[PDB]
Symmetry: none
């Protein structure tokens, strides 16, 4: 019932298809999202943004809450994952998930090894939404509705630098993105 998210070609996003997720602000705003790696805890992989606006990163696939509905819609909990590939060293999933609080940085990082499906308290950290972000594009938001009695974080997803890389983390002012069919 909510408005469909559209890709840059004006086509409604479909769960199951592959989309690049690319900053709506180019230049110093950067490029697309991709799996990255930390040197100490090399698994799971982390979510990073390419610095070059000509690099669209790695595509993601959306998994709707309601598997009867093919269309990705605003303000509707979904799971999102980078396109699964055998990693040369990780067996964790590529599904996005909110991490535990990082006292060394003040950040709630978007990481991987999330889970698909089974909405409820157990999977709370794997549910994301999309909101409009001005006229530019769309922002991710973590504010799940899947557990009505749970206390939850409720925040846009923004960008934060860490270890020389650009990571995704909860932030007050969400980062705007657009979607391009892969």
């Amino acid at each position: 019932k909510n408005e469909p998210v559209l890709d840059i070609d004006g086509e409604e996003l479909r769960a199951g298809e592959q989309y690049y997720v690319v900053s709506a602000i180019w230049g110093p705003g950067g490029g697309g999202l991709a799996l990255g790696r930390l040197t100490d805890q090399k698994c799971p992989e982390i979510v990073v943004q390419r610095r070059s606006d000509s690099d669209y990163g790695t595509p993601v696939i959306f998994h709707n809450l309601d598997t009867k509905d093919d269309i990705v819609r605003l303000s509707t909990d979904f799971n999102v994952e980078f396109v699964p590939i055998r990693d040369r060293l990780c067996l964790t999933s590529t599904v996005w998930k909110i991490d535990d609080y990082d006292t060394s940085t003040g950040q709630w990082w978007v990481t991987t090894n999330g889970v698909i499906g089974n909405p409820g308290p157990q999977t709370l950290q794997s549910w994301f939404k999309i909101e409009k972000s001005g006229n530019l594009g769309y922002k991710f938001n973590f504010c799940p509705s899947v557990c009505e009695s749970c206390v939850t974080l409720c925040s846009d997803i923004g960008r934060y630098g860490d270890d020389g890389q650009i990571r995704l983390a909860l932030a007050e002012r969400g980062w705007p993105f657009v979607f391009k069919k892969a």
Copy 2:
């Protein structure tokens, strides 16, 4: 019921036929309407006007409220759609529709991805009218009657600069146009 809209050859406008929409004011008043886009937005396409009074732009097709009435009449809600070119580069529709208010410019833009048919609250932004704007020539007006209980904007459509281009937006005083059959 209402009086028909006439093309520049004095023939009544027929729903379903292609017409260019050309400024009644030539010279600095520009040419015809066409599909355009913005720097920061490939899709949906926007409605623009050619600066050159010899470029009639892209033709449109009118879709009447009453599908049993063939004639485009004054002061009557219709949908209007640009004829799609094949190198489209957008999957949104070419149907005109009023945008959400643009806080960065104070404008209610005319854009596309409108909807044909289903008159009522869901499609309110897609219904336009034609009014007289002289002893000759016409103007577009957004004042839908398809949802009697809906609160609606009710305004002429003028032109307004954006992104180096000439767009259409709601305005107090409408910009005058005439209609040229595209077959001719």
Copy 3:
């Protein structure tokens, strides 16, 4: 008369009013501009950017070329002075100025101890312009017209690291900022 610059609230920028100068690109793009100090130089103070986009830094005040025009306009030389949020040590001004070339870094830094008014060759390095940065905010440009017979640099202003900090310096492509009323 050129188009007025607007603050993020849509109001025309006014000469004499205090504005934070805040990066139009947030997150790692950082926050606002501030008076700073090099670790090895206490005076003059330099221009730095806060790394955190929640810190809008030190407000500036614009001083127009035309004393009778109160509106800050595009492509028009002005002086910019940091509101003096500082200790009493430096006797130098808080007015922005282009530095002499820095051979150790290859940079032409924005620093302070600039001069207000007296347009001409003597104050050439204290005159700045604002230009639109596409549709995302505004950029500073150093390309003064106060001395038509002078040879002058003509360049956008971008960011560059120095001393563990973020500084401003002449650059090919200007970095985008927005303006917030300090009040």
Copy 4:
């Protein structure tokens, strides 16, 4: 009359459109072509190859011999022109050109300051061809047909090291490339 060159999407190459020229061999085969400069000589710029296969280099634009043909075709003379995103560092052009013989290395380098159009003797060094490299790739080749009375070199173009960089030079065996549409931004 010749078959059209295709980009990685399978679409015919279009004269005037921007393309990255990217090695058909990844990893140790490197990335795309770009404008470079020698350490000792700043102008004209030279043609170099990025060592990283994730760096597609500087986009080029093709200018056909036949200005009324929009399609870049096999075995058909064109000019190639780098389109840099930054300000120009030289007053020389960014059009590819075959250099004078380098007695210090034995190479005929691909350099720039070439010329667009005016096919014939004066511009002979600015005309290049694309030929098939097997069946999955393309190679560049210098063998211009624009001056029927001229004596000319006629050779594929390979990679060769110079100045700690990867350059292009005439060679027996041509290096394989593919062509990728270049987009200014995600919204274009």
